[PDB]
Amino acid sequence: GALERLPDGPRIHVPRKTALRPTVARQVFQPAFAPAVLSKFDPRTDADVDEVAFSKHTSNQETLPPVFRMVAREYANRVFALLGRDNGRLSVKQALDGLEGMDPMDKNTSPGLPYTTLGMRRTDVVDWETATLIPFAAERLEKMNNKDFSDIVYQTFLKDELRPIEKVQAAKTRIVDVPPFEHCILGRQLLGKFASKFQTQPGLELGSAIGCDPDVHWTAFGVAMQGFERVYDVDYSNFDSTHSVAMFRLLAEEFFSEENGFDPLVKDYLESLAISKHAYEEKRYLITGGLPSGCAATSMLNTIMNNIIIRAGLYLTYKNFEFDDVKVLSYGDDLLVATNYQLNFDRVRTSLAKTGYKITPANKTSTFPLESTLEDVVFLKRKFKKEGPLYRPVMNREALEAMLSYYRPGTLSEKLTSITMLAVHSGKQEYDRLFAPFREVGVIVPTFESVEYRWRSLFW
């Protein structure tokens, strides 16, 4: 919300061409999916793609009910009881290299402004051997340590990905925010130690599936939610942008506080997310509210906020409602509710509507179901297929067909390799049907049994 126009600057090029090209499988499956609109003169839509992105951002809620603060500090207590309150600042070496059981910072990812305009990459700006930033990047990180984030400008552009036909026709393309490399480093310095612990322990207790692996953790999520009477599937509409600056304050004061073992600068970092400066062609603008994308912390933040928001909605809707009545499992905005009680999310939607957040009974078409179970719900575009004592992540047939129908030139084999591990859970007949078009034109792919056997190897 709250889009404030600033004086224009040098033109930072938003990409306006898709890298996605159709495979031999597109004509066979014919999915209701196409590359997202990136240009104003894209003939597939009447709309202006820049208008549709900028037409949003009306206004986030200035205030926020007291219940949000209570449930935030209550959720914090449970999180820090498990993980502990030793979430201190990591060094630049530890941020780049990552801790034990934590991936290092990706070298291929964009370094942000002004390095993208100058034509540099992440490995140009820093030395990963010695963790030595160049003098320009060193003083920018130094200024941020002195409570000054005025130099930080997010490189903003449209997301080159597949979208449903309705979104292509309406020019509703997702927005990619790329912060500077120093801002991305500092983020991992301030939140990395906590993240490493938060990532390694997904489940119902922590209320998160962040850092999970569907092949393995689906049995853990499945068996944990098996005993419960009902399981509800709830999705949010524009979850990222609906986060008010008040929600960022709550996280800084109640969750990521100095009492819970965090660096004093965490407050200032969270304010950079709350009030961010962006660049888009010659346009410069300031968005008050909403969580910018980019860097590894975005999913963790949304997950933490999701546990607070959904419970706050229940507290407002249902009186004498307890915290442990509902057990939550969520990956960012993708929310899953496990409980023995019967809950009506039609009344929760109306409650949360006043607070700014919008929920929908996904997928379907409106009207939340009162009765729902583990087999009904969809999480990360996967269902819970019980097979003996295990649970298999069965990905959607329409999703699988769409992923195979398009590709980026150069990395086809790498893509096909990763889709076999997804498609294996559908079954041999479906596996072969999905890859049949590729085999027809002389492209070898591993046998169903080879990849089936490999999945079972994880359990031995």
Exposure on the CB side of residue 26, measured as CA atoms within 13 A: 13
d(CA 106, CA 98): 10
The helix-helix angle for 448-457 and 428-440 (nearest 10°) equals: 130
d(CA 338, CA 230): 6
**Cβ neighbours of residue 444 under 8 Å, at least 6 residues apart?**
none
Question: Cβ distance 155 to 14 under 8 Å?
Answer: no
Question: Order of strands across the sheet with 283-288?
Answer: 3-6, 283-288, 275-280, 154-158, 175-178
Experimental method, per PDB record: X-ray
Q: Which amino acid is at 453?
A: Y
Tokens matching residue 241: 């942008």
Tokens matching residue 347: 């009344």
What DSSP assignment string belongs to 11-45?
A: -BPPP-S---EE-TTHHHH--SEEEPP-STT-TT-
- Report the run of H or E that residue 382 belongs to, with start and end: strand 382-387
- Report the run of H or E that residue 244 belongs to, with start and end: none
Q: Which amino acid is at 398?
A: E
> Measuring CA to CA, how many Å separate 79 from each of 73, 74, 82, 287?
10, 9, 6, 30
**Catalytic residue selected from 233, 268, 333, 334:** 333
Q: Where are the alpha helices (DSSP H) in 154-279?
A: 165-169, 181-200, 214-224, 245-250, 266-274
Tokens matching residue 240: 């990222």
Output phi, psi for 236, to 5 deg: -100, 150
Q: What region does 147 belong to: left with phi over 0, alpha with psi -120 to 50, or beta?
A: left
d(CA 421, CA 457): 13
Domains observed in the chain: 1-202+244-297 (no CATH), 203-243+298-395 (3.30.70.270), 396-460 (1.20.960.20)
First to last CA, the chain: 50
Question: Cβ distance 307 to 288 under 8 Å?
Answer: no
Q: Which residues pair with 163 in a beta bridge?
A: 34
Look at residue 56 and give its three-state secondary structure: coil
Specify whether 103 is catalytic. no
- DSSP state, residue 374: T
- DSSP state, residue 255: I
Length of the chain: 460
Cis peptide before 409 (omega within 30 of 0): no
d(CA 422, CA 118): 39
**Could you count the other beta carbons within 10 Å of the beta carbon of residue 390?**
15
d(CA 430, CA 243): 41
d(CA 251, CA 237): 21
| Beta strands, E only, 132-174 | 132-133, 154-158, 162-164
**Cβ neighbours of residue 47 under 8 Å, at least 6 residues apart?**
37, 170, 171
Looking only at the bridges linking them, the beta strands covering 154-158 and 275-280 are parallel
Question: Cβ distance 67 to 312 under 8 Å?
Answer: yes
| Beta strands, E only, 91-152 | 126-127, 132-133
**Catalytic residue selected from 151, 235, 325, 346:** 235
The helix-helix angle for 345-355 and 297-317 (nearest 10°) equals: 110
The helix-helix angle for 181-200 and 67-83 (nearest 10°) equals: 70
d(CA 432, CA 359): 37
d(CA 411, CA 217): 27
Look at residue 239 and give its three-state secondary structure: coil
**Could you count the other beta carbons within 10 Å of the beta carbon of residue 269?**
22
Q: Which residues pair with 164 in a beta bridge?
A: 33
Specify whether 235 is catalytic. yes
* Token pair 């407050």 in the structure block, residue: 267
Q: Which amino acid is at 91?
A: S
Question: Cβ distance 72 to 255 under 8 Å?
Answer: yes
